[PDB]
Amino acid sequence: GHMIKICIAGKNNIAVNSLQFILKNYFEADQIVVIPNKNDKGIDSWQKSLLKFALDNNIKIVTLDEIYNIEQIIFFSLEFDQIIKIENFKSDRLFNIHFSALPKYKGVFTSITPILNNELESGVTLHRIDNGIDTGNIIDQHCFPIDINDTARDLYFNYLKYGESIFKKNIQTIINNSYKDLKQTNINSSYFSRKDINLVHKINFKKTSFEIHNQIRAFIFQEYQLPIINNSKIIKSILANEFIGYNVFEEFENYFIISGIDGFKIIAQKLNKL
Amino acid sequence: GHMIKICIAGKNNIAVNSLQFILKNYFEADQIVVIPNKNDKGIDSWQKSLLKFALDNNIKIVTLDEIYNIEQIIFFSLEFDQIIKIENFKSDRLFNIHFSALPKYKGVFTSITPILNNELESGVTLHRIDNGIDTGNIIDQHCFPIDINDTARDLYFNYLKYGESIFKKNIQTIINNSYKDLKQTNINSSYFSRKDINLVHKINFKKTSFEIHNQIRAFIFQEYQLPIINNSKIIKSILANEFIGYNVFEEFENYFIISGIDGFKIIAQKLNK
Ligand SMILES: Nc1nc(=O)c2c([nH]1)NC[C@@H](CNc1ccc(C(=O)N[C@@H](CCC(=O)O)C(=O)O)cc1)N2C=O
Numbered sequence: 285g286h287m288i289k290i291c292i293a294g295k296n297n298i299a300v301n302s303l304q305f306i307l308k309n310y311f312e313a314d315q316i317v318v319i320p321n322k323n324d325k326g327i328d329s330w331q332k333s334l335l336k337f338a339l340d341n342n343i344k345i346v347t348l349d350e351i352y353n354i355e356q357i358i359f360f361s362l363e364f365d366q367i368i369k370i371e372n373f374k375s376d377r378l379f380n381i382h383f384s385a386l387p388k389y390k391g392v393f394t395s396i397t398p399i400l401n402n403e404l405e406s407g408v409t410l411h412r413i414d415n416g417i418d419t420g421n422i423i424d425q426h427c428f429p430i431d432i433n434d435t436a437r438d439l440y441f442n443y444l445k446y447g448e449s450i451f452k453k454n455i456q457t458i459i460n461n462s463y464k465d466l467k468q469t470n471i472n473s474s475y476f477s478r479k480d481i482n483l484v485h486k487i488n489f490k491k492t493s494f495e496i497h498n499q500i501r502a503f504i505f506q507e508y509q510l511p512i513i514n515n516s517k518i519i520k521s522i523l524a525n526e527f528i529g530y531n532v533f534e535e536f537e538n539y540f541i542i543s544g545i546d547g548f549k550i551i552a553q554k555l556n557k558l
Numbered sequence: 559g560h561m562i563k564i565c566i567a568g569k570n571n572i573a574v575n576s577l578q579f580i581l582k583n584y585f586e587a588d589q590i591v592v593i594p595n596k597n598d599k600g601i602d603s604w605q606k607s608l609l610k611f612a613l614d615n616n617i618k619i620v621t622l623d624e625i626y627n628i629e630q631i632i633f634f635s636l637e638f639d640q641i642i643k644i645e646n647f648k649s650d651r652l653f654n655i656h657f658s659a660l661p662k663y664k665g666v667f668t669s670i671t672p673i674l675n676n677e678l679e680s681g682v683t684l685h686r687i688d689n690g691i692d693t694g695n696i697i698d699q700h701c702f703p704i705d706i707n708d709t710a711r712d713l714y715f716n717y718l719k720y721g722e723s724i725f726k727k728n729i730q731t732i733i734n735n736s737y738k739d740l741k742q743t744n745i746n747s748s749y750f751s752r753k754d755i756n757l758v759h760k761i762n763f764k765k766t767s768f769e770i771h772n773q774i775r776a777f778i779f780q781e782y783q784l785p786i787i788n789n790s791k792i793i794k795s796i797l798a799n800e801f802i803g804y805n806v807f808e809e810f811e812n813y814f815i816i817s818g819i820d821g822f823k824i825i826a827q828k829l830n831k
């Protein structure tokens with residue numbers, strides 16, 4: 285019977301827009317609490333700030349320890365950074381939106397790992413939180429394409445959009461506790477940790493054009509880093525069906541022309557191109 | 559035309575059985591020549607020797623240099639070990655059966671690479687040889703499952719069986735030169751070289767059970783090697799859907815019980831040897 289009905293924990297446009305949605309449609313400000321990620325400085329930047337939205341709309345900021353004992357609270361992680369232990373919570377209403385098509389690509393850097401592993405599609409998945417990393421039972425999933433020249437950043441913005449949508453699609457059944465779920469399968473399950481990914485990726489050119497292009501574009505996310513080829517930052521990679529011969533590599537003022545062991549043209553655009 | 563009509567280059571039961579098939583159904587011995595792989599000494603083992611079958615059936619052994627100038631020769635690579643350059647040959651009738659579902663898994667160790675990269679299926683592909691590594695246009699393909707507990711060796715034996723079948727399915731149209739082919743796509747194309755694969759694999763246990771299982775069984779091919787956990791060789795991995803808790807690892811006299819970050823039970827059976 286507590287005042288507080290729901291907690292939004294996490295960051296970025298998905299957390300802010302989902303919070304705004306529930307404030308507009310389901311709960312009053314005094315029924316909601318927020319746990320921003322540790323790094324949230326309260327500044328709207330290339331993403332909206334959850335801390336800023338809470339402060340601007342009179343939504344209380346809390347810690348996990350403040351909400352553990354709240355009976356029946358709905359806890360939603362939307363890019364939240366702390367692993368929870370479910371036995372801390374009195375409530376069993378604990379949910380996450382994970383930026384992959386589970387069971388594939390559990391873990392981190394999920395705007396990098398599907399592209400680096402040659403996928404043509406990804407997804408967002410709403411699931412129950414259990415004590416493992418993105419291992420809980422799936423409630424809903426939406427799969428969508430990774431277009432051939434999408435960068436990690438382009439994929440991330442698609443996760444924000446489709447994740448916000450799957451939140452809205454499912455929130456009423458979460459609130460009325462009538463949702464259905466299904467155990468994740470063992471097969472196809474994959475996982476990457478921060479140690480598995482070197483963000484300063486050294487490209488293996490003894491690979492197909494599709495693999496070289498994926499090795500480039502998986503690391504294009506300018507707020508964090510850009511790939512460097514021959515001491516030049518790369519902002520875009522374009523893969524064509526044109527055969528140009530095997531193992532081409534040529535540097536120009538504004539781009540590189542590259543092909544791998546199957547000979548298909550890649551244009552890797554330098555950041556300095558006007 | 560020249561006496562010689564066809565060259566079978568390569569090894570193992572796919573080469574021997576495809577050569578037997580064409581000797582029975584199409585060609586006389588004098589019309590066929592063979593190029594065995596470098597290490598074939600004419601002794602059958604866990605696969606038949608191509609060199610031995612040729613000698614036993616009065617088929618001549620040749621080098622590539624001896625066939626370049628033979629007009630209209632059919633050249634067929636069946637696990638052959640040398641990259642050819644097509645402009646050496648007068649003939650454009652140059653074909654390979656590659657042990658993967660192209661365009662995926664160009665290159666080598668293709669009983670290892672699909673498993674290691676978490677595939678549920680593989681295939682055999684008949685294609686024209688061009689100057690790149692498994693890059694030429696596809697003539698036919700047969701895909702098939704990698705069962706959940708199959709090892710690299712099990713996969714290899716399936717390539718030999720399905721590869722022999724796709725050879726028999728297509729040989730008449732190759733002989734008649736009526737076959738059809740299609741360029742490979744750029745998307746999905748992948749490639750592994752010998753440098754990419756360390757055959758003494760160190761397992762990463764901070765992975766899912768399906769990934770740990772695949773890391774083990776991708777290297778089980780006893781005639782070459784077996785993967786080693788705590789100085790025991792593993793002969794079989796078994797992945798179940800039973801949840802046993804996250805990140806289990808326990809060693810027993812005859813097996814290990816392992817789970818990864820998602821908690822599904824693996825039994826890694828030690829070689830009884
Ligand atoms: N129990 C739980 N399950 C989840 O699926 C989940 C939560 N909590 N809390 C919110 C969010 C947190 N997700 C994560 C994912 C990875 C790390 C992390 O620190 N990974 C380390 C390895 C940690 C380890 O090995 O124990 C790394 O280096 O990658 C932290 C939080 N989340 C779902 O999104």
Ligand SMILES: Nc1nc(=O)c2c([nH]1)NC[C@@H](CNc1ccc(C(=O)N[C@@H](CCC(=O)O)C(=O)O)cc1)N2C=O
Nearest residue numbers: 635638639640641642654688689690691692751752753
């Ligand atoms: N031109 C050509 N294309 C082919 O697709 C083909 C042939 N020849 N000849 C028969 C067979 C030979 N396949 C191969 C495949 C890889 C290596 C090899 O030596 N790979 C080295 C890398 C070589 C390099 O980078 O140039 C390695 O270390 O992996 C040799 C023969 N074959 C299709 O089967």
Ligand SMILES: Cc1cn([C@H]2C[C@H](O)[C@@H](COP(=O)(O)OP(=O)(O)O)O2)c(=O)[nH]c1=O
Nearest residue numbers: 363392393394395396436440483505508509
């Ligand atoms: C932290 C970081 C993220 N990214 C990108 C790729 C990630 O999928 C995306 C979101 O990362 P983020 O959610 O901040 O990290 P995590 O995956 O550890 O929870 O930002 C980088 O490219 N480089 C980085 O250094």
Ligand SMILES: Cc1cn([C@H]2C[C@H](O)[C@@H](COP(=O)(O)OP(=O)(O)O)O2)c(=O)[nH]c1=O
Nearest residue numbers: 637666667668669670710714757779782783
């Ligand atoms: C040479 C080698 C092969 N193999 C297995 C996996 C290979 O897919 C299969 C056949 O290899 P093989 O055709 O001899 O070598 P390549 O791929 O270089 O042409 O045998 C091993 O497991 N270990 C080895 O050392």
Ligand SMILES: [Cl-]
Nearest residue numbers: 319347348349
């Ligand atoms: Cl906290």
Ligand SMILES: [Cl-]
Nearest residue numbers: 412414420421
């Ligand atoms: Cl669950």
Ligand SMILES: [Cl-]
Nearest residue numbers: 387467468469
């Ligand atoms: Cl699933």
Ligand SMILES: [Cl-]
Nearest residue numbers: 622642643646
């Ligand atoms: Cl040659």
Ligand SMILES: [Cl-]
Nearest residue numbers: 642643645646
């Ligand atoms: Cl030469």
Ligand SMILES: [Cl-]
Nearest residue numbers: 686688694695
């Ligand atoms: Cl071709």
Ligand SMILES: [Cl-]
Nearest residue numbers: 661741742743
């Ligand atoms: Cl194709």
